[PDB]
Amino acid sequence: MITRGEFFMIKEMYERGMSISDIARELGIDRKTVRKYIHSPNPPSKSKRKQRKSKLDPFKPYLQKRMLEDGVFNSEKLFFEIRQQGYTGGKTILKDYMKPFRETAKKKYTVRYETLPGEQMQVDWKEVGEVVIEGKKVKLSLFVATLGYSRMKYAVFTTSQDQEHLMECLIQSFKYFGGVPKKVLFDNMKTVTDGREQGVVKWNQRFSEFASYYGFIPKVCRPYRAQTKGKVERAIQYIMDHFYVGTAFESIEELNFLLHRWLDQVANRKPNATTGISPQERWAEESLKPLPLKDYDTSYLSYRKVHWDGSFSYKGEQWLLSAEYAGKEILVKERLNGDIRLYFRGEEISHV
Amino acid sequence: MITRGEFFMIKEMYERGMSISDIARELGIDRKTVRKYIHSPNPPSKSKRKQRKSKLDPFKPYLQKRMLEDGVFNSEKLFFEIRQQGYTGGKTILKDYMKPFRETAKKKYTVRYETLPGEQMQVDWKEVGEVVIEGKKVKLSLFVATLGYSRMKYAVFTTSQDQEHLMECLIQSFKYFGGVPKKVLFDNMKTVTDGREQGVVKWNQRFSEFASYYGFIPKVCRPYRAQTKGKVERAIQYIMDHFYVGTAFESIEELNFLLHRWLDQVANRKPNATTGISPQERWAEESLKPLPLKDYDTSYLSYRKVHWDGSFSYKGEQWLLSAEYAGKEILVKERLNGDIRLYFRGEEISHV
Amino acid sequence: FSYKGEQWLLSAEYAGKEILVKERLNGDIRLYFRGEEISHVDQQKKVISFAEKIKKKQTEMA
Ligand SMILES: [Mg+2]
Ligand SMILES: [Mg+2]
């Protein structure tokens, strides 16, 4: 088992012409050993041995059954049990054998990553809570979109977290940043996925079409791990401890106006604590893909029938449609702003 | 403002007979100052000055209103607001003024106390959960009583946390320890208190009578602070991670038998990690007050009426009472073990 | 904290921090924290349980 260096030295000194016996004398090795190593391929310094029997082998299946069906992980309890069965050794071997079965405590070290310019964006929601806006109880939610390289922040308040609202907020973010990223990171929302099909993710077909339309590649971090999108979560903490702490409002339009003004004043103006530069300069450094001229229409699409007289009803509303549109089927495109339009076989109805 | 030592030296050297001028020369003080201090009561080394005006005085009421009604504690937001009002200074003064109003983050240091022998005991409950025992869903609870000086542990399982069950478990603990403590520490349970009447505690009248009967003085730690009774909580963790982890059972009597055997085997036998001695030896060192001969009767007491024929019904049960006990009022003493006894004006009924 | 099977009680400032114990071959323990020197722990030949140390600190603070 002469080590790498010893074998190299033996072979080299032997090939140099030095006599073998005095080589052995110099290296303090037996002459037979040195001569055998002369005609050897490479330094031998490794011995392979397979596993061997231990004391806790007969009890091992029983302990495994205890762990995997009774959920017992108390080394003292298992030791006391098996001691009656016949075991006589200490607990160290038991702990060493049982350690792999124990759950892996979550780490505390946190890797840091710096995405390339115009290469990544992050999105998330924040359930603000229930408020009485204009005498109406609604569930307010905050949508936050954080750029990855410039740390920009766009935000907007909404009353619902429907796929339509998500897509519209993404449109607003893309317009705000003057382009679309090459990658957009969400969490595992059903408006973007439909579960992990054996490790792989199954994208919602409509959302996949939307992404292919705007060209941005979706990504999802992982189940029950929000660290991977720390930028946007920390931006949420920033906004909810700086803007929505004492600000008072009565209309969501007013709140959104105040939020945009606040962002453009301080949030996207104050230099970041890590990049140490105003986010707008980095934004100017960003290179996002151009937006399409026509935005992906995100509006509720329903089919309704006009009554005999010509009175058409949608939600708690009523219209008066010409007699030619009575008893037929029409399309009611409801934009998220409340602009309802009526269509009949492509044509647009001048609804009264 | 000559300090204590300087004044002492001046007075002493002057009274010794040393000339005053060379005293002043030696101590590097003016002759007038030294002479004035000669006839002085005590060393003058303190100057008292009252508060003075600052820059954030006019804004202080507004900031206080913001904090106390809008809940804003973001120094950046308040600074940005008041800067428009006219403030021109830095944020350090703002943070210093606003610090007292901020909530006091909980400490992490933990005082350690060692009660005197036979002087303190602690009690607590542990809601194990819901189990199907004998095809019946019951809410299992664990009652734990930990001695303070010997760290003994008594425990018992129960289906309810009623004042009657609490008192009976206390009786069992006192019998187990061979005596009653001089102090018993609970948490703020309504079976022992009725709320903090302006800081002071109002003891439940029945429980107060029970305590006065057994002579042990009750105590309650504080609202929302379980550290003060760490012994019993840690004993609960011990029992729920050592005994009730994999043990299987079908009857609560079996579970209690196993629990008592386990306690007397290991729990009250293994030396403690801090006292470093077997709890039973310290128990032998304990000096508890003697138990009363007759235990405080903890049994449901209800008054019922016997039907015309003589059929008396309690819960889903039926009896057959002699005709002389028909149409009258009787007492149904239900012991917690299920021993129902019938009483009629002190006499006991030989119910069939 | 702990040292060679004996548990010592420090003050509030030292809780949650790494101290350095230096023990001469003579047999005396000296606790150095953050370069400075902290109060001696009056090491005794007879081992005293953590409970007795808690009681002693309690009486001292009393
Ligand atoms: Mg989310
Ligand atoms: Mg409790």
Curated annotation (Swiss-Prot), chains A, B:
GO terms for MF: DNA binding; DNA strand exchange activity
Family statement: Belongs to the transposase IS21/IS408/IS1162 family.
Pfam families reported in the protein's UniProt record: HTH_7 (PF02796), rve (PF00665)
Biological role: Involved in the transposition of the insertion sequence.
Annotated region of DNA binding: 20-39
Stored InterPro entries: HTH_IS21_transposase_type (IPR017894), Integrase_cat-core (IPR001584), Resolvase_HTH_dom (IPR006120), RNaseH-like_sf (IPR012337), RNaseH_sf (IPR036397)
Name by which UniProt lists this protein: Putative transposase for insertion sequence element IS5376
Entry keywords, A to Z: DNA recombination, DNA-binding, Transposable element, Transposition
Gene3D superfamilies with a match to the protein in the record: Homeodomain-like, Ribonuclease H-like superfamily/Ribonuclease H
BP-aspect Gene Ontology terms: DNA integration; transposition
Region (Disordered): 35-55
Domain HTH IS21-type: 5-67
The UniProt record lists the keyword Acyltransferase: no
Domain Integrase catalytic residues, every copy: 113-287
Swiss-Prot record, chain C:
Family indicated by similarity: Belongs to the transposase IS21/IS408/IS1162 family.
Functional note: Involved in the transposition of the insertion sequence.
Protein name per the record: Putative transposase for insertion sequence element IS5376
Organism: Geobacillus stearothermophilus
